[PDB]
Amino acid sequence: IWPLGKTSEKYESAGRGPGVISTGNGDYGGASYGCYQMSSNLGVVQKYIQSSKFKEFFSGLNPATKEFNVVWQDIASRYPQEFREEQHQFIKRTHYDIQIGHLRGKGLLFEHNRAAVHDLIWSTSVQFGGRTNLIFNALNGQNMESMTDKDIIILVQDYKLVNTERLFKSSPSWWSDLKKRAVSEKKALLELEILEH
């Protein structure tokens, strides 16, 4: 009953409905769509539409245009639950599943654990990519039991926090917030792991 990815939603969806469209500033700002704001500039919203049961609603239309946007919000208002759910599934496939699959090949298995570890996997996969090595590295040289959900959580969240500057060299202006986030998610995930059982 724990929605996968709930721990980090405030950083990803931030309470947006599935009809939320934002126009980007700059020549290449484009438009961003839905709960997770799929960027047209990054090709993401186009890929999602290719796979969507709503594909044909958008036939002949292109993102970041008035017409596309009318269709997008019509679908959001007629199918808020369907649209939201499919958007979440698209993010799951493009991140969560990929990280789950790669960790499986590197030897790491989670079939399955408390929502907390899976919220860690989700969060970490969306923030660093479906093929990130950050979890596998946080856990490097470690017998895969004597490893509780709690140890796992502490390990990768401590890893994220100390590598904030290495991982974000180019952006020293956003360090303070990026560290606050890793700390904040550590606390949330530990609370969730307990409420788990």
Binding site: G26, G129, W174
Partner: protein, 94 residues
């Protein structure tokens, strides 16, 4: 922003927008001793885009931050380069 990804993107993109604008305004200024080709901004802006877009391959939101942060750095460089060029043409010709 409170670490909200999209809010970070908006902030950087606003800086990018300011840089783009300052560069187009320089180029537009009218004295043909500078000799900027017609599609100079748009071809340079594009080249900068394709270069920075490689950063997506680094993965997830982090890739976007680096990408957007690269575009900003390249445009800041382009702008300084153009200003400098304009200053050198100005104090060299008569």
């Amino acid at each position: 922003t409170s670490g909200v990804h999209q809010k970070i993107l908006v902030c950087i993109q606003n800086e990018i927008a300011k840089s783009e604008t300052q560069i187009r305004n320089n180029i537009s200024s009218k004295s043909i001793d500078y000799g900027f080709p017609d599609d100079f901004y748009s071809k340079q802006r594009l080249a900068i885009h394709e270069k920075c877009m490689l950063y997506i391959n680094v993965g997830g939101q982090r890739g976007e931050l680096l990408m957007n942060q690269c575009e900003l750095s390249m445009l800041q460089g382009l702008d300084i380069y153009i200003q400098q060029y304009i200053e050198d043409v100005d104090n060299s010709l008569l």
